[PDB]
């Protein structure tokens, strides 16, 4: 949500390491709560215990995405030490996609997840670096 | 006349077609009238 | 762009629309609307199994006349709206002349740029 | 903020969730819609009586007579549903599948 | 030019209100008259292009392509019989009127004032060719071919509209004259990189480049002859024309970000020449030939020498004529035997003796006939790219060797070695095919005489 | 007439209630053509009373 | 027991010849075949090809080419008559420039 | 046209052309015995108009010009071929039967159109109900795969659950040997190549299913073979009847208006014919369909709306 | 029913939407929405199947709770700065509830669950009138109350409506669900501009209404509800094929055709702000929702499906249908490319 | 190995299968009512308390 994504962008890039992973796990747990809420409110999984299992699995996978993404973010920022590229977070989003493919146990599907999540992470870092206004100006 | 005892239409009337030709002539005369009045209005003003 | 003095309700053809030159004969847009009317009547005869290019000649004439009439009034409203946009623009130029300074129109004898050689 | 308004709006929200979630019938859902109607009526009535809003005092009576005929329409619809079946369950409505 | 647009609007109802066995001669005759009428076009001189109206202006890049389009129409309109003679009169009128409407949007596309009008007429060019190939595709996957075609060309050509509106509201009007005068270098940001990649990627998709050329083989093996020739010649060289016009802006960053397109173009040209060396289904060989030549065109565009642009437009016009001719040769083979393959129809030196002259001449024009326009284009592109890099001549010459190779194998697979002596249903060589070949190749040799027309605006 | 045409099994594939049958959705049976469900059940014989010695 | 179809044996092989041996390329109406041959070999070659050939063989020169030849001859004779070297470099006036200094 | 909502408001009713002449009587019997004989008899006696048996070319015989089109267009039924070989691998039974189903529906629509349009009541014969009896007996003889029978049953589920039943059914019973004697009297050898167990199954299902599914809706008057002409007796017990069952006492104006405006626009009636399930005896390839439609347009009368088509008339395309 | 009764009920639908259009007060707007509901119920269930019964049930429940949520938002607005004028609100929460209530009222992707289900099991006249007037009514209110809306709501509902209206339908073969998904997509396009220049939104509303009238009129050319019926419309008449072709391709949004004009001008007055990611997302999904259009086209307009006889029987009969106004709306709704400067007609 | 099968797996197949799977997951909602109103409820709650719109 809004206050904790502002917490994530408040953490510089920059090296204030593994607080980045704490914030990214919080973001992933929020998103997993969203999609798990849809998946339990649109299915009737029969029963309640299986619904709790599906929610915990979805939140665990999404928090794993955020965790490993923030870890390799910090690893790129500490080893290669280029702070303002889209290339490190391209690598990071690919790492998150491949670990999602690991947790769903699919290989080419995990490679597609690597490609798309890396491109989205490159878009996020790249547009945030140059400065592209999210959602609106909203002026004219 | 070549049909199995059933003319639905086709033999034309003389109310609908005359009414349509009359109202289209009415609309042409009205648009030419309006356009000449507006040309005269623009000549009046400038 | 909002009304702009709706005092003075919707008023499909306003009073000041007669204070501007109306469109004339053989203007291309009304000719386009007339060809659209011809195609309208032709395709109307093409809907039912009556033959095309025949037996709908009063429908041809009525549809062409009606579309030219409608499009003529629409063109009048269109030119009114563009004219009042122009007058509102130049009146806001007149209201705040200070906010729009004349830019430094240097001649190219004193303009420095970059070259960026392609080879 | 006239703290009776607080739990009136709270009970409005609980009535709205009663309209939303329901597991067996539809008449109970329509009845919770009527309770939500009562909540709107009461809130508007207390406000217009507080403000000395004497000129447009038509709002609560007209609100309730209109949402009353809404509820009548809902009754006729549920009678048609219950008449083309034996019951009025949320179940046996899953036809016209998506 | 409006006097070239308006007789095409007059040519459409000609097809409708001419009667049975009367549509054909009237359409053919009058479109040839329009070919005369726009042969009268070339008034262009000296300092500027010939520029008449808020509506119209024509460069000498647009001049030979427009003449080529109106010349290619009636040839095609005669070429597309024998597969709809048995069809309905109304469906025949719909076919011919769809061709005329497609020509009209081609001329609209070539003489666009602002690039918004160019984009509108660009996808207006896109739409009826779909209807042509889908209504008369004559193979079971015309479904898949039209679907691939429309989705690739839209979804590659989609951000082009956004980028053009962005250039509209950042630099005033989008007319090519003032944009020629109000260009300014937009340096290495990242938004400049995305915008350049948007425009260039849309026209890349139109060429096609090697990265997503896969729609192009299906769109030529699963199309009738008219849509095939229109598609190949006018649409791919129209994409090249559009890149030629839009590349005037965005000069400072092309040294940064023009390297990988050169790479994919060169290596995919080599791989395309490799993959067409072996395949059957003779009709597809011309399509991969087109992919190779347009990869060469794309290299010629992205290096930015006037030598390169003149060679580019020469290769455009030459491969348009050659590929249309060779398509009609493949159509003649497909009318003879109902195969479309490569190894079945063999022999044909005995049978159809002067057909061999046209196959030989077509494989010569693919072979870079030594005074032909094709060799002029390939030669000047090799000159400019050897100026651009001293080591890229290896790939160019390897392309040359394999180009000669597959063109020669395309010749000697069909028309050399043994008649299969079981076919026994070929009719003798019609006057129609030889007439169409005389309509193809006499203009190519005339332009080979005095090619000062076909060189572009940087003449 | 030498042209390939779409056929019966092609239009079957462009048929049914849904386009893509999966591991669950194949029981989504195709809707009828008059949009009229059959008159099913529920007590055409309406009701009974027993006036006894009460 | 089933064939799923009702059509003809489709298609049918149809040779265009052996009903008009003097036919040209297209369909079995023989007179309009000669009409088509006449219209394409007169209004495609006899009036299009050679007339466009003589049109493009000479026309007023593109890029004012012979004009540029004679202009260059005049200007080179001018500059060699007035002693200064032909093609003086710095094509714009260096006195009429305003260089932004460092 | 004097129909639609405005004509229904300005016009009086759809009910004041009643009654006791406007009625649906339907003579139903076996093939070659219960036929147009007693139908034309009661049509002349009771003063009530008559439709013939629904022909194969009845659609040609009811619109356009009276001359029937050849069996390339109205076929491909070939009732003589069905009597020759009713086990065709080429497909002859069900195509014929669906065409006759459309013919029965067309003539029943003509019947209800003439009934609602001012009167004055009609006699019918060999209805839609005898058509499903024909299909059931023809399946008892083992001529059709059961899936195709299910398809016809689905057509019956769609089209029959829409309309009103007739008023009365005058049933004729003629025994099997007597129909054999009458078909020997008829003497058509194509028709004489029919078998008799098929006829036996027709009469068995035609008594055992049709008559209980009447259930005094469509009041039946069951006659013997010599209980015929006897025209006085059949008009006497038609006079006996009282019209209790059926929805004819409950319409009363709105649904009669609905069927008046529904029976006309005959294409709205006949849109529910092709369901389709694709019926491997019944479908047509695209090339054959195209050439058949072009040859249909190559008739003089049936060439795009003959009321406006030239060469027959009508001297007015408004210059 | 009676024709006089239907005259009265359609007159009341007209009157209800006009009262929504015309009043400066809130109560009359809510009464207009309610009268719209009350009068649009009996147009559905015009036949007598339980399909229309369950459809009317779903429509009544969603429609009613949307109206009640709207009345809640108005009474919250008078809990804050107190007047019954239709202008800028005085609460983020009241505007939040009001946009959510109007989103349930017309149909956005969080709230779109009732629209295909109600549009399937109904006759075509009911579906046409519900689509046209139920998308016409709340857009007037949104046009009036626009300067008080947080952009996150309209933006999220618009993006999600375009993408869910795209992604639904690719499995769907029922034509009513296809057209309802198209309605969701075009309402998302109509919503995403309203905070920038609402003239484009009302213009897209006019264009979509004319297109929907042409679409359902050519579906009322004969009784068709599935694609195979459209193959039979191919083999029974040739002009219906090309008209369905051109109207489908104008719903697709291609530049030489009229349905591109609402898309491109929206992109223009979007991108005179710095919104680029939003046009490229919306336009990629506008590429996406053309595929079901295109497979309908590929099915029954350009390929030639095998047909069934008794179409031979149907060949004898004229198309004696009534068209409300088909050809006028058709050729006005397709050839309207060069009249793009009739944008300014809307002031 | 490069053009046909692998290029047709990388550009059309991933996109087409992704859209097919998103269709078969979204439009395959079985026709209940409580599911739709619980979706309404989670929409209202996730708009209020998670990612607020009033604040
Ligand atoms: C492929 C995507 C092409 C998107 C259209 C081109 C474009 O404007 O890209 C820049 C856009 C965003 O860049 P932008 O143009 O918003 O960057 C701001 C630039 N100034 C400061 C000059 C206004 O890129 C994308 O949307 C990436 C997807
Ligand atoms: C940015 C640049 C993008 C460049 C590529 C864009 C186009 C990609 C390829 C589009 C065509 C794909 C295609 O034709 O796939 C075939 C498939 C239909 O095949 P199948 O699923 O087997 O259906 C059986 C039919 N009887 O068809 C489908 O599955 C079509 C599914 C919709 C695809 C729409 C186009 C892509 C949209 C992407 C949105 C994100």
Largest interface: H-I, 43 and 31 residues
Along the chain, the helix and strand elements of chain J come as: HH
Structural class of chain J, please? mainly alpha
The shape of chain C is: flat
**Share of helix of chain C, binned:** 40-55%
The major pleated sheet of chain J works out as:
none
Terminal Cα span of chain J? 55 Å
Q: Got a strand count of chain C?
A: 0
Say how many strands of chain J there are: 0
**Assembly level:** part of a larger assembly
Explained architecture:
Chain I: This is NADH-ubiquinone oxidoreductase chain 2. Chain I: The chain crosses the membrane at residues 3-23, 25-45, 67-87, 96-116, 122-142, 145-165, 178-198, 200-220, 237-257, 274-294, 325-345. The structure is cut from a larger assembly and holds 10 protein chains of 10 kinds. With 98 residues, chain D is mainly alpha-helical. Chain D has a single domain (1-86), classed as Helix Hairpins. Chain D contains 3 helices and no strands. In chain D, helix 1 (4-20) packs antiparallel against helix 2. Chain D starts with a helix and ends in a 15-residue tail after the last helix. By secondary structure, chain F is largely without helices or strands. Chain F has 1 helix and no strands. Chain F has one helix at 8-13. Chain G has 102 residues and is mainly α. Chain G has 3 helices and no strands. Chain I is mainly alpha-helical and 347 residues long. Chain I has one domain (1-347). Chain I has 16 helices and 1 strand. In chain I, helix 1 packs parallel to helix 6 and helix 7 (151-167) packs antiparallel against helix 8. Strand 6 (283-284) of chain H pairs antiparallel with strand 1 (307-308) of chain I, so a sheet runs across the interface. 1,2-diacyl-SN-glycero-3-phosphocholine (PC1) sits between chains E (159, 162-163, 166, 191, 194-195, 197-198) and I (274, 276-277, 280).
Task: Give the arrangement of secondary structure elements.
This is part of a larger assembly, with 10 protein chains of 10 kinds.
Chain C: H1 28-47, H2 57-95
Chain F: H1 8-13
Chain G: H1 30-46, H2 49-57, H3 65-81
The structure holds 1,2-diacyl-SN-glycero-3-phosphocholine and 1,2-Distearoyl-sn-glycerophosphoethanolamine (3PE).
1,2-diacyl-SN-glycero-3-phosphocholine sits between chains E (159, 162-163, 166, 191, 194-195, 197-198) and I (274, 276-277, 280).
PDB class: electron transport
Keywords: complex I, cellular respiration, mitochondria
Entry title: Isolated complex I class refinement from Ovine respiratory supercomplex I+III2
TL;DR?
It is classed as electron transport. The entry lists the keywords complex I, cellular respiration, mitochondria, electron transport. This is part of a larger assembly, with ten protein chains of ten kinds. Chain B contains one helix and no strands.
Structure keywords:
10 chains; G: 102 residues; mainly alpha; J: 55 residues; binds 1,2-diacyl-SN-glycero-3-phosphocholine; binds 1,2-Distearoyl-sn-glycerophosphoethanolamine; NADH-ubiquinone oxidoreductase chain 5 (chain J); transmembrane helix (chain D); NADH_UbQ_OxRdtase_chain4L/K (chain D); mitochondrion (chain D)
